[PDB]
Amino acid sequence: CGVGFIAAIDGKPRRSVVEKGIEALKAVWHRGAVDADGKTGDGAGIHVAVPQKFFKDHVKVIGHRAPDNKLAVGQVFLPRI
Amino acid sequence: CGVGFIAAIDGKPRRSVVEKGIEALKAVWHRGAVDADGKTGDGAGIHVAVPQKFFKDHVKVIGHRAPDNKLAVGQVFLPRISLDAQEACRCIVETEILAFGYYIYGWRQVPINVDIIGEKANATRPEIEQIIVGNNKGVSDEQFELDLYIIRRRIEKAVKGEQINDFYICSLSARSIIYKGMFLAEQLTTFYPDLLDERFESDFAIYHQRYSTNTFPTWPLAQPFRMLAHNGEINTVKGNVNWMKAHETRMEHPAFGTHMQDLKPVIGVGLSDSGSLDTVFEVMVRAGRTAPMVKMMLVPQALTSSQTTPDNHKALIQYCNSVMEPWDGPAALAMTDGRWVVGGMDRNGLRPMRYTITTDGLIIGGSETGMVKIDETQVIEKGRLGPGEMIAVDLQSGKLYRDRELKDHLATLKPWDKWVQNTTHLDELVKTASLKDMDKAELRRRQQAFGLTMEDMELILHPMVEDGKEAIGSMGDDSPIAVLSDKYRGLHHFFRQNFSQVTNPPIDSLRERRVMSLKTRLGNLGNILDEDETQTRLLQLESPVLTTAEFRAMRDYMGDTAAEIDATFPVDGGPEALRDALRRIRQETEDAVRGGATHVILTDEAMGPARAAIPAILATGAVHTHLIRSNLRTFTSLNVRTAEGLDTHYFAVLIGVGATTVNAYLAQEAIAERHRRGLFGSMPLEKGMANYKKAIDDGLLKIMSKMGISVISSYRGGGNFEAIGLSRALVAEHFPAMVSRISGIGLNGIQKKVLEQHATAYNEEVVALPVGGFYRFRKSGDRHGWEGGVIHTLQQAVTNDSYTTFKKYSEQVNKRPPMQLRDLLELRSTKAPVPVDEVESITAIRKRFITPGMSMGALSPEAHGTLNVAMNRIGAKSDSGEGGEDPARFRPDKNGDNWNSAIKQVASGRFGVTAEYLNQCRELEIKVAQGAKPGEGGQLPGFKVTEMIARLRHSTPGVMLISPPPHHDIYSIEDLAQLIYDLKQINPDAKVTVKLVSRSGIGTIAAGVAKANADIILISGNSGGTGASPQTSIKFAGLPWEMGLSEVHQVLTLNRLRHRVRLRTDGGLKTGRDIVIAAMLGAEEFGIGTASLIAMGCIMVRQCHSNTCPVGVCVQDDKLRQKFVGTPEKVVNLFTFLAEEVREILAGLGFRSLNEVIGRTDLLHQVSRGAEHLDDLDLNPRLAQVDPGENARYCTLQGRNEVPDTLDARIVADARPLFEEGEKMQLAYNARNTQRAIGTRLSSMVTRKFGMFGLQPGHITIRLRGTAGQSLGAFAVQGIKLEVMGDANDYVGKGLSGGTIVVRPTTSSPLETNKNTIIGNTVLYGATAGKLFAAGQAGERFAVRNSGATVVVEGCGSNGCEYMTGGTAVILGRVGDNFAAGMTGGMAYVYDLDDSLPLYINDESVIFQRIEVGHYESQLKHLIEEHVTETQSRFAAEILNDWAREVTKFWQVVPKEMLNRLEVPVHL
C-alpha cells in the first residue's frame, strides 16, 4: 500500500528515473499484507512515458519505414479462455 | 449424451413417472464423456410438473394460508462470489413481479450437497433459489402464463441493463419446473434431495444428458431449456438468426399488446443454437398455436413430388415452407407445452429415437431402447420415429396420436387447398411471354475487362454445355493464395467454402436428391404470428439462377414496381471512388425502398471506356447489410446481373451474401457466340442451355450439401464462408458475420487492381484473350510451386545421391518469391552455434517421417509396393490408403522386404475393411476428410477398376465407384467415440489416429477428439493431392495447414490436453526448412506426401483421372505399367537427404534435438514486402503462445490410452479350453445396454488363432437375455454365433465377416412379430460375408454398403439397401422411401401385399420384376426355410405354408448391371 513518483526538474528523459522507480517498488513489501503462499498479491502498477526509440526499432524490424513524428501505443486486456 | 421422455396417457399424475425418470437418468453414463477425476460431468437435466402440495405445505408451515388456485414457482441462479449483487437481483425481480398485482409469498433456499461436485464446476457454481408467487387476481390460467412470460422477458432485459453477470431464470411458470446442473447423470438424485419426497408427482418427465466439446462448464448452458430438449447440433444457425432479425421488424399479434414492443430482441446473445431455437419456439407457441403446428413450421418434412403424402398434407407443407424458413440439421426433438407432449425428428432423421407403449397407459421414449426396466409381459407395441414423423400425447383430453393420425388431425383446421391455390410458378408465365445481339469486338473487350482467359475458360465452360458435368481435376493445387498473387484476381478467389467434419455429417447428393429442394420465393415475407390466406400470394421459382429471356419475363411481369441501380464508378475519380460509390448506392437503395419499390435490381450494363464496374460481391454485401441494419429487408428482394459469373463457386458466393436471384447475361451471350461458329456439332442452343442450367444447379446443390444443408432458403444470406486476405474492418462493416483471422487488402488494393485491369483492357485494341495460367502451368504468369527445372534437378539429385545437387535443388525451391504464409516467416535464434555432430543422430529423425496413404485404385500396385518396401526398410511408418490391401502382402518375402503396411485406413466406404485386415497393422486411421476435397471422398472413374480392384473390394467390374461422403456411423461426436471404442477393441495393440482438415473452428473438434480417446491428430492442409476430383472443390476449399495446426495446438494446450496426444501435419512439404517450421509450430510427426511421387516417376502430367499416365504410376493397363522406372533406393536416399538437411538447419540454430524446439514461438518473426504496399498481414494471431504450465509442451505418455472393459473379457476367461484345444462351446449371459461391442475381442482372438475361415459355422455360441448395446457383434469372424432374446440397439452386425447373428423376441412377449422395431439404424454397415436373421422391423439405412452378406428382415425403413454392392437381402413387409438408391450389385426380394412398391423404390439403376425362373424361387424358398428354422417365427411359417399362393406377391429387385453378367439368365 502506497504511491510514489519521481520527476526530473529540468525535463530531460533518462534511464535513472525508471531505474529509481523500479528500485522504489522493490522496497514496499512490508506495508502490504503478507501471504503464506508466497505468490499472491494485491496488484501493483507503474506509469511512465512511451520510449519512442524502442517502438520505432520494432516497426523498422517489421519492415515499415519509421515515421518522423510521434507514435502511439495502446495496451489492451482481452479474454484468454 | 441422450434425451428421453416418459408420459402418462390417461392424464393422472403419479410418482412412478419421476421414479422411472430417475431410473433412466441413472443409466446414461456409458454414452457421455468419462473423466479421470470421477466427479466432473458434462451436464444433466430433468423437467417435471409442479408439486402443488409440497409448496402449499411450505407456505402453510411458514405461516400464511394456502390458496385454492394454482401456485407458481420460479427457479433462479444468482451470483455467488458477491453478496450485494444478490440484493440487486432480488430487488429487480421483486419490483418487476409486483408491478402487475401478484402477491409474493416468499423465497426458499434449495438444499443441496456440494460434495459431489468436481473441481472445475465448483469454481463457477452459482446460488440456486426459488420464489413462490400466488394468483390472487382470480384470473384464468392462460393470462397467468402469458403474464409470467412477459415478466420473465422484462426481468431479463432489466438485469441486462445493469450488466450484472451470471443471473439466469431457469423456469418461471405454474405448470412445470426444471432441475438442471453440471453434475453427472448418476448423482442427480443425490445433488437435489428434494426429488426424493413422495409428494413430487407429475404426469410427464423429460430428461437430457449433454456432451461437452471442451472442459470448462457453464451452468446456464445446461439442458433442458424452458420448452425444448435438443439432441445434436444445427447447421444453419447463422442464416436463421439473420432471418429472425429480419422478421423482428414486422411481427405483431393482439395477444400480447403494449408489452409486444418490449419483446423485440427475441434472440439474445451468448446462447448456443438450441437456446435460440427454444426461445423462438416459445415465442411462436405463446401467440396461440399448438405444439405440433409450430413443430411442423420450424422443421418441416421433405416435400417430395411422390404419391405417398395426400394432397391436404401437401398443401399444409407448402404453407409451412412459405411462412418461415426451416432449421436444418440433426435434431431429435422432444418438446412440451402445458397441454401437449410432442416427440419428433428432423428432415433426414440422423439421430435416432425409439418409444414403447405399456399396458399401464404409459409411454416411454428416448435414444436407446433398454433404458428403463420393463417386464416383457406388459409391452403392447414398439416402434420408432423415421424422417419427419412425430408422436403426440394430449394431456387435457388424454389421448395418443401417432404420425398419420396427428397429421390428419392437423390437416383439418383451415382450408389449406384454398390458400396455396393463390400462388403462381414462373414457368407458364415465361412460356406465354418469350413466344412474343452483341458483336465480337465488345464481347472480347468486356471479357478482357474481367480478365477471363481463353483456353482455361474453354477448359471448364465447354464440358458444361457438352455433357452437363463440371470439370474433373487430377492433382492438388499449388497456386499461391489470392493476396500473395500479383495479377488480377476477382473477389471470388478470396472466399473459401465451409464444411462439417465430425459434429454433423455431410449429405449425399447423387443418392438423396429427393429431400433437397431449390425453390425460391418472391413475396412471402411478412408477419409470422398471423394466420390468413393473404400471406401466401407470391412468386415461386424453381431455381435462383436466371437466364436472359426469363429475367426479361420476370421484369416485364413486375413492370413498374421495381427499381434499377447502376453498379459502376467513374475511373477519372480520385483515390476514393469506390468509397463514395458505395455510399451513393447505399443511400439510393435506401431511398428507393422507402419510396415503395418492393424489388431492387443490381446491374452493371453501364460499363464503358470511362466507367469501371464494381465487383458484385462487395456491392450486394453492402446493400444487404444496409437494408438489414435499417429494418427494410423484409420489404423487398435483391436481384443481381453479373458480367463475370462463370463457375458454380461464383453463384454460390453471390447467393450466400444475400441476393435472391442471380442473373448472368454475358455467359449466355458468349455461349451463343461460340455456338454460331459451329463448335458443338449438331446440338441446338436449347439443349446446350438446358445442359448448362442443369450443371449449374447440380454444382450449387453439391456446394450446399458440402456442409449439410437441404434447403436453399435457409442458406441465403447465411454467409458460410471465410475471407482469407481481407481487412477485418471491411469484412466487418460491408459483410455479414464472417471471420478473417489475418488481415488483408482493403478498399485501396481492390481499387488499384481493378483500375489497372480496366486500363489494360480499354486503352489497347485487344485481339484475343491471354492463354491463362491458373489451372495448368504457362509462361505468361502466375508462377507455381512445381516447375520443370525443379523436378529435373530433384530427380537427378535422388538418382545420383549427390548432396550438393540436392542442396542446389532446395536453394532453387526456397528462392522463388513468397507464395505461401511460411515464406513470410524468418526464423532467428539467439544463442551460439553448435557443431553439427552434436545434434541427434540421423536415424532418430528418419524414424519420424511417414508417407501418407494413397488409394490403390489411384496408383499402380508397383509404386505402392515400392513405397511400402522403402518405408519398411528405412525404419519409418508407411500408410495403406482407402483401397485396403492385397492379402498376398501379409507375409515377409524371401529377400527380407515386408510388403505390408504399417497403418491401415478406415475410409467412408469400408471398401477393404475385414477382420483379417484390421489386425495385420500397427496404428489404425480414421479419415474424416482429405485435404483436396473436404466433403466428397475419393472418386474413381468407371474404367480404372480392373478385375484386381473388383476382387479387392468385391465390387462389380467396370462400374463407377464413388464413396458416400458422410460416415454413415458418425452423425455426432458420440458416434465417433463409439467407433473409436470398437476400433480399440478389435485391435488390442494398435492406436487410433483421426485425420482432420484445417479450417476455422477446428479447435472445438480438436478438444472433442482429444476427449474421445484418440491418440494422434492428423491436420491436413489445402494443397494435398488427389486421384480424381472436381476442379471447384480443389480450387476454393480448405485453408493452409499452418493456421489450423497452430489453432489446434493452442486450443489443445489451453484445455490441458496437449500432453496426451501427438500432432502431425502434412500438405505441401518440399524442403527441410518447412519441416523445422512445422516442428516449431507444434507438430511432432511429418508426412512428406507427394514429393516421393515425383522422385518415383511422376512428372506432373495431371492425367491420373484418365488411366493414361505416361510414366505409368496411375494406370491400370498392362502397357503403361511396364514403363515404371521407380526404384526403392531412391526414396531411401531422398529421406536421408531430408534428414541431413534438417540436421544442418538444427545445428545452425544452436539446438540439439527436435524435442527441444516443439511448441516454441520465440524463434520466428514476420517479414513482409513494404514496397508491395498490401495491408500488412498481421500474423500475430498465429505466433501467439499459450503458457505451458507444468506439463511439457511436447510431452506424451508412453503406450496408448486406456479404455474400459466390456463383457468380452469375462467370456474369454471362461472359454479358456477353446484357445488350447479348439472345442465347441456354448455360453449364456444377461445383456444390458451399458455393454458395448460384444464379441469383438473374442473375434480378434479367434482371428489371431485360426484366421477367418478356419472354424466350421457355429463353433462357439453365445446366448444373451435382455437388450444388447451399440454395435452388437461387430466384426464377427466365421465361427461365432450370437443369439439374443429381447431387442438390439443399433449398428448391429457392423463389419460382419463370416459370423452369424440372430435376434428373436422372447417367447413370453405377446407382441406380433412383424409390427415392432427390433434393431436400430445403419444395420450391417460394410459387411463382407456371413448371415443375419432377425424377427422384426429395422431402422433407417438398413443394410447400407453391403457386399456379400445374407440378411433376412421382417420390414425395413427409409433408404434401405443404399449403395449395396453384393449379397442377398430378403425383406418381408412394407418398405420405406427411396428404397434401393444407388444400388450397384447383388439381388433383393420384397414381399409386397398391395402393389405399393413402385411408388417407393428408386428406379435409377435398378429394376423391379416378378420371379419366373425356378432357380431363384428355390433359393428364396431355402432362405426363408432356414430363417423360420432359426428364429421360430410364426409369420414366416404362415408365409411358407401358403407358398404356392404367396410366391406371386414377391417382387425381385435387380440392378441394371447384372443383366448380362449373371450366370443364371434372369430373363426368359
Ligand SMILES: Cc1cc2nc3c(=O)[nH]c(=O)nc-3n(C[C@H](O)[C@H](O)[C@H](O)COP(=O)(O)O)c2cc1C
Ligand atoms: C494421387 C493421390 C492419391 C491420394 N489418395 C488418398 C487417399 O486415398 N486417401 C487419403 O486419405 N489421402 C489421399 N491422398 C492425400 C495424401 O494422403 C496426403 O494427405 C496429401 O497428399 C499430402 O499433401 P501433399 O499433396 O503436399 O503431399 C492422395 C494424394 C494423392 C496425390
Ligand code: F3S
Ligand atoms: S501428374 Fe499424375 S498421371 Fe502420373 S505422371 Fe504424375 S502422377
